[PDB]
Design a protein around this nucleic acid. Structure first.
Length: 400
RNA sequence: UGUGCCAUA
């Protein structure tokens, strides 16, 4: 802090004016100091004369290097965002030159700003507050090489991509969809803790749900094609995705979203069906198998049930079948609990049995009798386990 | 008896 702005206690003076700081030439010293930036943030929200704004514009967002210095500063980035807001609210003759400049500054340093913990915040507010036509040019400045992968999996930069998805029309970021759908890119991004959230955010935006009814038909068509291309890529790798520590959340999202019903069915047929016993025994994929049972169309649900009850040959020596392996497995037990719950819900009316013009009620009764007969026969062993006790309880509590 | 991310003074 400048000596002129300090007392004899070494602390920043009180009754300090915004014009004193703007005139001094010392703004950069205040903006990167906690207390100094704290004063500027208050001063900047008040009534500003034309000249005060003019000076903030020139000092905070008028020169590339000071702008970068502040944007990437722990305290400075807040002043930059405030001044960007004030710039956008000030429709004088210099409006367009200021906004074009800001667009140039950021564009030329897009990647580095995105990856910066503080500058990514400047990017994000610019994206949502700038005129749409200028915000779209910020998106064009995104990298198209390995740097985009790095952006998607970065703890800071992933929020930039998510913001783009939120406030920019699809045409401008359609390249990100195609980038992510590329087989090797999808693999890397989906199997990352930040990247899998980015991919789901993209999927949600590409879904024709209640939040997209404002779209024109041409825009819905554009959305559908992009969805279709991303989903094709996801389903081509559903096996790797469903079994992965992070990507399983994506597969669960698709499987349980009614507005993605056609893709849910594709996934079930592509990697789930015929692998139910195997997958039910995996730490990550068992959650996906539960989702499938819960949201499958009744025709596929019947196939899934039939696979568990009669899809596998028992062990040649002991007589242990798929249901046996599953009821006692550390992960598979949750899938059996899920099958039971579905049947009880159906038979007690808590779940719609009509679908495909016909009533599948007797199928549910059939599956329930199977489960009830097994649990009755194995009650002694099942009562050793929390999961077993839960099933026994469920069956008795349905009779009541 | 079984998994994540939701990030600045």
């Amino acid at each position: 802090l400048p000596t002129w702005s300090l007392d004899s206690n070494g602390e920043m003076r009180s009754r300090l004016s915004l014009s004193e700081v703007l005139d001094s030439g010392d703004l950069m010293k205040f903006a990167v100091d906690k207390t100094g930036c704290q004063f500027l943030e208050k001063a900047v929200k008040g009534s500003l004369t034309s000249y005060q704004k003019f000076q903030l514009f020139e000092q905070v967002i008028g020169r590339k290097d000071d702008f970068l210095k502040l944007s990437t500063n722990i305290f400075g980035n807040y002043l930059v965002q405030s001044v960007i807001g004030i710039s956008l609210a000030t429709n004088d003759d210099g409006y367009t030159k200021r906004q074009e400049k800001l667009k140039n500054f950021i564009s030329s340093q897009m990647t580095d700003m995105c990856l910066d913990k503080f500058a990514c915040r400047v990017i994000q507010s610019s994206l949502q507050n700038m005129d749409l036509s200028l915000a779209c040019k910020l998106v064009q400045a995104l990298p198209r090489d390995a740097r985009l992968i790095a952006i998607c999996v970065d703890q800071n930069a992933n929020h930039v991509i998510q913001k783009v998805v939120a406030v920019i029309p699809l045409k401008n970021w359609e390249f990100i969809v195609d980038f992510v759908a590329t087989p090797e890119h999808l693999r890397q991004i989906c199997s990352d803790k930040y990247g899998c959230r980015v991919v789901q955010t993209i999927i949600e935006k590409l879904t024709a749900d209640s939040m997209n009814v404002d779209l024109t038909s041409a825009a819905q068509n554009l959305r559908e094609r992009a969805l279709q291309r991303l989903m094709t890529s996801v389903t081509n790798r559903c096996q790797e995705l469903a079994t992965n520590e992070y990507a399983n959340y994506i597969i669960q999202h698709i499987v349980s979203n009614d507005d993605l019903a056609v893709y849910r069915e594709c996934i079930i047929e592509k990697c789930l069906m015929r692998n139910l016993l195997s997958l039910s025994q995996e730490k990550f994929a068992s959650h996906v198998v539960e989702k499938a049972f819960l949201h499958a169309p009744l025709e596929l649900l019947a196939e899934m049930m039939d696979e568990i009850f009669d899809g596998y040959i028992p062990h040649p020596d002991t007589g242990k079948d798929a249901l046996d392996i599953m009821m006692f497995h550390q992960f598979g037990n949750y899938v059996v609990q899920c099958m039971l719950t579905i049947c009880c819900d159906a038979v007690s009316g808590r779940r719609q049995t009509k679908e495909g013009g016909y009533d599948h009620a007797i199928s549910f009764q059939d599956w329930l009798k199977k489960l009830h007969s097994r649990v009755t026969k194995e009650r002694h062993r099942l009562s050793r386990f929390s999961s077993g006790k839960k099933m026994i309880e469920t069956l008795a509590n349905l009779r009541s």
